[PDB]
Write a protein that binds this ligand. Structure first.
Ligand SMILES: [Zn+2]
Ligand SMILES: [Zn+2]
Ligand SMILES: [Zn+2]
Lengths: 66, 302, 46, 51, 452
């Protein structure tokens, strides 16, 4: 410390996954529409920049002081 | 350079994914995460000729190895269903067809056993089973220097809160993966931004934590940040932002613990002195002399 | 504070920030200790 | 080693769980007085340690 | 070695031919499996997003401990023409090759692959009983031909011209026998995957005629690497050029066919071993009396050991032989250097020799820890004797050319000698003797210098 689903709609969602697996699992649908991919790339590059600026540098290290 | 083993621990629960479908605008996100996982496994098998794939699903009533099939089931089988097109690469096709066939069987089992609602999540047991399989592939040593990597595709969907029973098995899996040098990447699909145990799993085992809110474009997340091969782990930085504090929850209050007291017998963490001067976990009676020093107020002149 | 003003009027603020940041955590810790001391003193006074 | 039943030293032990501080500027640690980038600030007195 | 050879061959491919090579997904997958892991990671992260990715973003991916390797990966993507650079907004933007990206995406997700992986005809035979036996039979046939042992069956003239026009396996018609070169014994040294690769790249070097198309050969080689053993594939997807070169490797042994010009063809184990790899036979014991106890039963190892070991007796397990002076003279007259022989004797050394060498080095380190010595798995006396026989073959070296002398002035001799040194053909010069010598290939340059 600092929306429970019913079994009916549970089975309906399961059967929806069943019939979506029967007809065609088109893997080419995983390709983004080049708009969400820009957001994903921006998020990943910003996280990389933060982590790389943190982990750029980590016997004591040399100091600029005399 | 060196081939690796990618063991996928996917947490498919009909209650968990239904909550994500209700919260999201789209429906049937199981198909989307499954096809993203299939493309990611085909990508991993394309990385090296000698790499291997393990897929284990944690459902409500237990765990089951999606790929490869059971040896009794392999001997029993082969009805080649047309879920996946047959004109693709055969190495990808066998893995994809086996995976979707075991999705079919496991969802038929879930539909059959839908009347019983389980309050015990089996994600940690699935991670333990994946670690046993990783040790088997290392111990078997059919192939020289196989490396390894766990990838846990879990979903919280804002419904399943933090599970305190999972804490010890997840920590044991962390220590086991650190012993065998197996990085654990975690993808969480849901509204819960922070998952403390899984973030600790990614941080302590040199893995990558990645929380997403939409199942669309998931292969763009997997092939970019989860494609860190164990051969190239130290030379590639990890995008796992949001560093975890490595703290723990108290035993009798449940809050995240500040400076506090633990039992010297059972190591249970207490945010405050427990009532009755006895440990709530292992029932060890505390000495009244020593706890008065902890209760002693600090000194300053008038 | 005397060392901070000494590096301020010696190095001319080009290196005074590094000197302050080098001793920043110990300064914050002794400030927290003095604040706790004053808080408990004022608590016992009242 | 498993302890004896006659041992009655069941005392609560006080400790805090520090947070891994992140900083691009090196600081003097409280334990060795050397320049270390990372560290763990003490939850009780805000002092940093190496390990 | 193996990846470097195919990388350098694909460097020599022109850019338009390289882009035409990216049509079939199997070729793209087989090419992608050659790339370094950083390059493969960047490609795989870069396929699924259609927008172009900056190079500075890719620089942020790599930690400081592997940055140089990153450059090498970029260099490979600067060599294979997979990454197109662009100058936009003052930035060196990087774009993926569209044909390669589309073909790799079709290979991964499945879809339009224009039967680059073939079609299974569901009729099959046992791989170990027939397909492994046929490939091993053809490989042992060509190897026993090239090592020079007599054979009742010799391979066809397609590979005889291959061996004749290659740098290795020189042929003479004045005697009627085939002479192994230094490159031949080099070819006998490494494992069979890069042996097959060297053979296939030499075949690729020979093919310039209008009967054969280079891109079709590369596509067929890469799909043969993609095909799996134990299941036949239909011939209808192949062109007539692909059909005749399918017959060519049916003769060579990469592929099995039940009859000539059949509707199906069976891939062999060499097809899957073409991509990547995966006491023993041929393990030998060397003693101080030059006796070789080589635990070999396959005729290939016995035949290649007969090039430099005077064989005395043959058992089921070993071949009792001896390293004599005459056998080593036979090996060196074929150009087989002493270093190659010593490397072969090292690689096939017995585990017991390794244990004895380890015990000797353990006694050495506890006696003299100040210096470290390499693990001499075989005795140094036989190594020294092999090198001594190499030296007595080459006691004299003969350079043929022309000697210029009889200069009345020393300045003219000095000018001609420094001209010969500048053109890099002089071997010896002396102002006291007033003589300077030049090689055969450098005669004509000094001739046109002196005449004009
Ligand atoms: Zn206790
Ligand atoms: Zn320190
Ligand atoms: Zn402290």
């Amino acid at each position: 410390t600092t929306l429970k689903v019913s079994n009916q709609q549970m089975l309906q969602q399961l059967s929806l996954v069943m019939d979506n697996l029967i007809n065609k699992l088109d893997l080419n649908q995983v390709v983004p529409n080049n708009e969400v991919s820009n957001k994903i790339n921006k998020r990943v590059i910003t996280a990389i920049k933060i982590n790389a600026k943190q982990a750029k540098h980590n016997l004591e290290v040399k100091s600029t002081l005399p | 350079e060196s081939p690796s083993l990618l063991t996928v621990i996917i947490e498919i629960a009909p209650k968990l994914w239904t909550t994500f479908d209700e919260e999201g605008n789209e429906k049937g996100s199981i198909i989307k995460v499954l096809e993203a996982l299939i493309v990611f496994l085909n990508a991993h098998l394309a990385f090296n000729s000698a790499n291997k794939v393990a897929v284990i699903a944690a459902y409500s009533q237990g765990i089951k190895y999606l790929y490869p099939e059971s040896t009794s089931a392999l001997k029993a089988s082969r009805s080649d269903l047309k879920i996946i097109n047959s004109d693709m690469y055969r190495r990808f096709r066998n893995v994809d067809e086996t995976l979707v066939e075991e999705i079919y069987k496991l969802f038929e089992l879930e539909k059959k056993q839908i009347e019983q609602n389980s309050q015990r999540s089996t994600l940690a047991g699935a991670m333990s089973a994946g670690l046993t399989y990783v040790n088997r592939i290392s111990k078997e040593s059919v192939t020289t220097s196989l490396k390894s990597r766990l990838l846990v595709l879990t979903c919280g969907s804002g419904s399943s809160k933090d599970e305190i029973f999972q804490y010890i098995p997840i920590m044991n899996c962390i220590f086991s993966a650190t012993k065998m040098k197996c990085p654990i990447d975690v993808v969480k699909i849901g509204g819960s931004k922070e998952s403390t145990f899984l973030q600790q799993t990614t941080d302590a085992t040199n893995g990558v934590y990645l929380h997403v809110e939409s199942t669309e474009g998931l292969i763009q997340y997997l092939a970019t940040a989860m494609f860190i091969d164990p051969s190239l782990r130290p030379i590639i930085v990890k995008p796992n932002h949001g560093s975890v504090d490595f703290r723990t929850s108290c035993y009798l209050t449940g809050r995240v613990v500040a400076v506090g007291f633990i039992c010297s017998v059972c190591l249970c963490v207490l945010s405050i002195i427990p009532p009755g001067n006895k440990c709530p976990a292992c029932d060890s009676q505390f000495d009244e002399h020593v706890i008065a020093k902890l209760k002693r107020k600090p000194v300053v002149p008038r | 504070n005397e060392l901070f003003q000494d590096v301020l009027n010696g190095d001319g603020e080009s290196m005074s920030n590094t000197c302050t940041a080098y001793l920043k955590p110990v300064l914050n810790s002794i400030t927290l200790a003095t604040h706790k001391y004053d808080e408990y003193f004022n608590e016992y006074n009242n | 080693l498993p302890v004896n039943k006659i041992n009655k030293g069941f005392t609560l032990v006080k400790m805090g769980f520090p947070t891994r501080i992140f900083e691009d500027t090196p600081t003097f640690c409280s334990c060795h007085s050397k320049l270390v980038y990372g560290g763990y600030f003490c939850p009780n007195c805000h002092s940093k340690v190496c390990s | 070695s193996l990846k470097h050879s195919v990388t350098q061959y694909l460097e020599e491919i022109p850019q338009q031919v390289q882009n035409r090579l990216y049509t079939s997904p199997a070729t793209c997958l087989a090419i992608y499996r050659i790339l370094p892991p950083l390059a493969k990671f960047f490609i795989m992260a870069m396929v699924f997003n259609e927008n172009e990715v900056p190079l500075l973003d890719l620089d942020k991916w790599v930690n400081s401990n592997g940055k140089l390797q990153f450059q090498n990966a970029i260099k490979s993507m600067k060599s294979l023409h997979l990454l197109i650079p662009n100058k936009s907004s003052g930035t060196l933007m990087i774009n993926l090759n569209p044909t390669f990206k589309i073909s790799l995406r079709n290979a991964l997700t499945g879809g339009e692959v224009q039967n680059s992986f073939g079609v299974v005809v569901e009729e099959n035979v046992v791989s170990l009983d027939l397909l492994d036996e046929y490939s091993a039979n053809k490989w042992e046939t060509i190897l026993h031909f090239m090592v020079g042992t007599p054979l009742a069956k010799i391979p066809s003239e397609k590979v005889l011209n291959l061996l004749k026009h290659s740098k290795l396996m020189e042929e003479v018609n004045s005697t009627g026998e085939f002479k192994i070169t230094n490159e031949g014994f080099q070819f006998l040294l490494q494992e069979i995957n890069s042996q097959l690769w060297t053979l296939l790249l030499q075949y690729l070097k020979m093919i310039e005629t209008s009967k054969m198309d280079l891109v079709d050969v590369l596509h067929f080689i890469f799909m043969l690497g993609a095909l799996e053993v134990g299941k036949a594939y239909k011939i209808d997807a192949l062109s007539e050029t692909q059909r005749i070169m399918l017959q060519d490797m049916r003769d060579y042994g990469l592929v099995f066919q039940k009859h000539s010009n059949d509707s199906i063809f069976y891939p062999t184990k060499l097809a899957l071993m073409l991509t990547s790899d995966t006491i023993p036979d041929g393990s030998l014991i060397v003693e101080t009396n030059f006796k070789i106890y080589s635990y070999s039963n396959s005729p290939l190892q016995i035949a290649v050991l007969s090039l430099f070991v005077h064989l005395k007796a043959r058992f089921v397990n070993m071949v009792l032989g001896q390293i004599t002076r005459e056998s080593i003279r036979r090996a060196l007259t074929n150009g087989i250097t002493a270093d190659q022989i010593i490397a072969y004797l090292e690689t096939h050394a017995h585990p017991q020799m390794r244990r004895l060498a380890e015990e000797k080095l353990e006694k050495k380190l506890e006696l003299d820890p100040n210096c470290k010595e390499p693990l001499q798995v075989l005795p140094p006396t036989v190594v020294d004797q092999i090198r001594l026989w190499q030296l007595e073959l080459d006691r004299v070296i003969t350079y043929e050319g022309s000697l210029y002398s009889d200069f009345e002035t020393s300045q003219e001799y000095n000018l001609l000698s420094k001209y010969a040194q500048d053109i890099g053909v002089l071997l010896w010069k002396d102002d006291k003797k007033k003589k300077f010598f030049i090689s055969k290939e450098g005669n004509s340059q000094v001739l046109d210098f002196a005449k004009r």
